[PDB]
Chains A and B, each alone.
Chain A
Amino acid sequence: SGGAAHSALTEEDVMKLLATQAHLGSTNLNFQMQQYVYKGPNIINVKKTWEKLLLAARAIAAVENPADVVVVSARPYAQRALLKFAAHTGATAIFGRFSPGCLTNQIQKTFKEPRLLVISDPRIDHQAVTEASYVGVPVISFVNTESPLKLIDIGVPCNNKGERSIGLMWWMLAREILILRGKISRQTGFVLEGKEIMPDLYFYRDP
């Protein structure tokens, strides 16, 4: 996306998706995500996944203070990715149970004031989505074919239900945000302080 050839879907990037099965959606289709479906499992269109990801990345970058971006997930497969994403992007991460009253109860010591909320799944983190609507906080989420888009601002179609694809999708979002920040660049790659940040730094590892 971006109306540019320097930000287009690259060959190895698209390669990674079929490696991680990040294009195999569920067998149920939500009528609001009939756009990102190319024709058993409903395989999603890769190009749409790319364009939405860049769109989400630009939105996250608009929050000048990275702390105000809060990433929330309760999926066990996302606990690894969520920690890394916050570490590299300087965001704030919520793991497991999302304490209700996080964004509405000003007395709570857990009280937070996000400017942008990123969700691993609308259904799993329904409480965060609901809490956001009480404070006018836009929400970005990774959405599968059957997921509900209610109160979802930007939905990045992908395979969040997958074990490996979920981690990869978080990895690109951190990359795209960093690429569009000056920390890294497309040619240099996902490197900070001389360390290769590798996709399986995010993948879920069984204890």
Chain B
Amino acid sequence: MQNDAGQTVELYVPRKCSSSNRIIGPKDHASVQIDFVDVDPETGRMIPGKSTRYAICGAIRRMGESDDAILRLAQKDGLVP
């Protein structure tokens, strides 16, 4: 958060679920961060050092919506048709 005369005096900016936009707290241990590797359409081999990061919060994972949440994020990013 921006404050003071323009400085940022926050200890750290928390992550937010890629699907529900909910903050992921320091003690949220049911939250996950899955990484998908990038590929070349023809060769089919992973591009070293390239990946897509998705973070899902414990609440969404616990409701069992993580499956379609990840699927919809991937469809949005083009990893899946």
Interface on A for B, CB 8 Å cutoff?
Answer: 1-7, 32, 35, 51-52, 54-55, 58-59, 61-62, 133-138, 148-155, 179-182, 185-186
Contacts and interface: CB of A to CB of B under 8 A. Distances in A.
B29 A186 contact: no
A58 B79 contact: yes
Contacts of A151: 30, 61-62, 64, 66
A149 B64 contact: yes
Contacts of B36: 55, 58-59, 62
B30 A133 contact: yes
Given A133-B61, A152-B67, A153-B66, A180 B45 contact: yes
B56 interface: yes
A153 B44 contact: no
Contacts of B14: none
B30 A153 contact: no
A136 B32 contact: yes
Contacts of A185: 44
Interface in B24-81: 28-37, 39, 41-42, 44-46, 51, 56, 58, 61-68, 70-71, 74, 78-81
27 contacts: A5-B41, A6-B41, A6-B44, A32-B67, A52-B71, A55-B36, A55-B74, A58-B39, A58-B46, A59-B34, A59-B36, A61-B46, A62-B51, A133-B29, A133-B30, A136-B32, A148-B64, A150-B64, A151-B30, A151-B62, A153-B61, A153-B67, A180-B37, A180-B39, A180-B45, A182-B45, A185-B44
A107 B54 CA distance: 31
A58 B37 CA distance: 5
Residues of A contacting B: mostly: loop
A133 B58 contact: yes
Given A2-B41, A62-B35, A154 B67 contact: yes
Contacts of A1: 79-81
Contacts of A137: 32
A50 to B, nearest CB: 10
B44 A150 contact: no
A133 B80 CA distance: 26
B61 A2 contact: no
